[PDB]
Write a protein that binds this DNA or RNA. Structure first.
Ligand SMILES: Cc1cn([C@H]2C[C@H](O)[C@@H](COP(=O)(O)OP(=O)(O)OP(=O)(O)O)O2)c(=O)[nH]c1=O
Ligand SMILES: Cc1cn([C@H]2C[C@H](O)[C@@H](COP(=O)(O)OP(=O)(O)OP(=O)(O)O)O2)c(=O)[nH]c1=O
Ligand SMILES: [Mg+2]
Ligand SMILES: [Mg+2]
Ligand SMILES: [Mg+2]
Ligand SMILES: [Mg+2]
Lengths: 373, 373
DNA sequence: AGGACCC
DNA sequence: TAGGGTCCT
DNA sequence: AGGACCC
DNA sequence: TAGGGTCCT
């Protein structure tokens, strides 16, 4: 139980893909999906004309005045397609980890080894790769690790074929020996393709990054910190003093981000299984007076009730969340959590009143059901 | 799945019992178990001379200058006897809930019904109670609920017999239709006896309480609150306005404590299973300079390492906890949590250094291992 | 992290 | 005024 | 409850 | 500048 083969699958322009499948007339047209004033994502025809992901509508329509826009506020169809994808991959190997609605990690290590024991001592010389080899690295067919990664590339090609034939969806895959590297290498050939990373190329891939914010796991906060410390490239982070860093971000945050700077990441792929919460949200900037706005709370509820329902399990907790306006409080949401009374779990009319009183102990409103059973 | 039969088992003067079993020469002598300046508990010979539970040593030895004292700082033997008791009860019925080291709830409902279907349509008239009937209530052998509670009293008598024959331990049991009432009724005949509560006596038992702090679930805090609201007896709490209370303690805290004031409590008996944390502590008032005291941290560790070991499972988290002195900050402990590095989980010498740095980001010190797997 | 509650 | 422990926000 | 991180 | 989601302190 040492060397792993992991694949990271990452779909193309996910919400746009789903909209292009719904209305074929949007294909071959530059297409953005809009949520409020945000073009959250756009198909590849639109990225040709300069549309980037997460541009405001304005910036997007003066970079490209001909861009089609569809509303993507309601996530229901993206969410349903996201679970179809995960459940397809779970069929190849049960332990599938989701990240957001369009990425899945799968530990192929068992599956690769069982294919290897199926091949006789001969056809092992005919193993080839499927897709690109990062940094155009030469393969050595006598290196057991290259062999396993290539079988891994083949599983990846079958998963993406299946996603295409069964669900109509294209995407990218990255095959590597842990999750960090599979997820970095899945973006190297962007549109609907796959890349495999051999160990000799690990430092090349990790040094190809131009800022430590690009390392999955280093966020808006830790990045700003690392800077204030003159740590700007991945190599600065690799060479920086362990102690200074230990004693500045916690043992935890420090010992881990420094591993990742090397390309080292031992986190297992975890079975995501069913969601741990179900929430809906609404944005409406400056609209919530402060009592004329609980209706809103009923809207949220309406959908939520249907969703939480359907799963099977019932939630044992309810939560209410807000924010408010003046200057750029860069972070500042508030919430009040409470247990859902047992009579109520077995509908609307009291829920509402749990929320209303929760709302009282109290730009934007949401409701979250959590603690499912 | 409506009416339940629950038993609450509550051992006599637990730590003292254990000490009296270790050193028989302490029997028939008034015995207190001491932790620092606190006589945490005392056997029944000592309660005759005025020793109460949780008296200071001073107050205890001038109420009773002849009282024997043994040190109970080290909990190891009380903890081991506590699990022997729980595992014995789990043998009667698997779902056993612990509360502290010497109380266990068991849902006898399945066990009672299967004994009932074993008795032919005749010997059902010969069912008798074992132990006391709260408030000396008359039994009605044609009341299915009285019958089930009496079979429940008989299971209770077998559990306490078994605890005595197998482990040498005496205790009390309370049989009732939910956990609140079984735990209130287990103290009515205190020393080594058992009481059963029939439904007609529920209001009598709940009104026998002299302050709402006595209701399991209403603590130091909510009690002081309830007062500031003129709510002093259980009847005040029962009659108080639901809304005023809803809108003053949360929907949660309010709707629940008001049920309990009635004797109503639907919480299931939960399987406690293995512990969710392992911690040790040390008190030493004014002793921790502020660097001369990490040794202390090594001591804690030493035992902890042995305990967490033994279970099987390993902990994935470590925590450090403190407090400090001036005036009576009535609540004020602090802690810094961090993940235990994966190399380390498979010993002392780095642990120490996780703690030491945790101690730096930072009257009394403790270490807690949690998040077991 | 800390709060609140239990033994 | 000890030395533990549980679950919630 | 809130923080921090991800898509 | 959206609408979701996960796990930790
Ligand atoms: C990062 C991010 C994505 N999304 C949504 C929109 C995306 O279509 C979807 C997937 O995120 P991504 O995979 O980052 O974006 P993408 O699939 O749209 O584009 P690409 O082809 O480069 O992979 O999740 C958000 O709504 N908010 C976010 O901040
Ligand atoms: C309440 C409490 C108990 N204990 C310990 C000492 C006790 O022996 C043990 C059990 O608690 P209890 O059952 O309340 O006390 P007891 O068994 O000693 O006395 P009784 O015969 O009245 O039931 O837990 C503490 O250490 N601290 C506490 O605050
Ligand atoms: Mg992505
Ligand atoms: Mg994508
Ligand atoms: Mg007790
Ligand atoms: Mg006791």
């Amino acid at each position: 139980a040492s060397s792993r083969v992991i694949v990271h699958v990452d779909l193309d322009c996910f919400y746009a893909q789903v909209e292009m499948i719904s209305n074929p007339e949007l294909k071959d047209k530059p297409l953005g999906v809009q949520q409020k004033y945000l073009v959250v994502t756009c198909n590849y025809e639109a990225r040709k004309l300069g549309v980037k992901k997460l541009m405001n509508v304005r910036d997007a329509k003066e970079k490209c005045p001909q861009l089609v826009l569809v509303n993507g506020e309601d996530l229901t169809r993206y969410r349903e397609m996201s679970y179809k994808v995960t459940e397809l991959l779970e069929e190849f190997s049960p332990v599938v980890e989701r990240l957001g609605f369009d990425e899945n990690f799968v530990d192929l290590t068992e599956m690769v080894e069982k294919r290897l024991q199926q091949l006789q001592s001969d056809e092992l010389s005919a193993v080839t790769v499927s897709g690109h080899v990062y940094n155009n690295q030469s393969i050595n067919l006598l290196d057991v690790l290259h062999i396993r990664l290539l079988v891994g590339s083949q599983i990846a090609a079958e998963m993406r074929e299946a996603m295409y034939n069964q669900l109509g969806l294209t995407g990218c895959a990255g095959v590597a020996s842990n999750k960090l590297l599979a997820k970095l290498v899945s973006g190297v050939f962007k549109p609907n393709q796959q890349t495999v990373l051999l160990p000799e190329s690990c430092q090349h891939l990790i040094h190809s990054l131009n800022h430590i914010k690009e390392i999955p796991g280093i966020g808006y906060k830790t990045a700003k910190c690392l800077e204030a410390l003159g740590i700007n490239s991945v190599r600065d982070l690799q060479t920086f003093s362990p102690k200074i860093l230990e004693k500045e971000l916690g043992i935890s945050v420090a010992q881990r981000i420094q591993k990742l700077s090397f390309g080292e990441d031992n986190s297992p792929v975890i079975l995501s299984g069913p969601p741990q919460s179900f929430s809906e949200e609404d944005s409406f900037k400056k609209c919530s007076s402060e009592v004329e706005a609980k209706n809103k709370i009923e809207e949220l509820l309406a959908s939520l009730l249907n969703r939480v329902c359907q799963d099977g399990r019932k939630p044992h907790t309810v939560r209410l969340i807000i924010r408010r306006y003046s200057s750029e409080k860069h972070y500042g949401r508030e919430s009040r959590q409470c247990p859902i009374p047992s009579h109520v779990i077995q509908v609307m009319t009291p829920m509402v009143d749990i929320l209303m009183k929760l709302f009282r102990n109290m730009t934007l409103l949401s409701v979250c059901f959590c603690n499912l059973k």
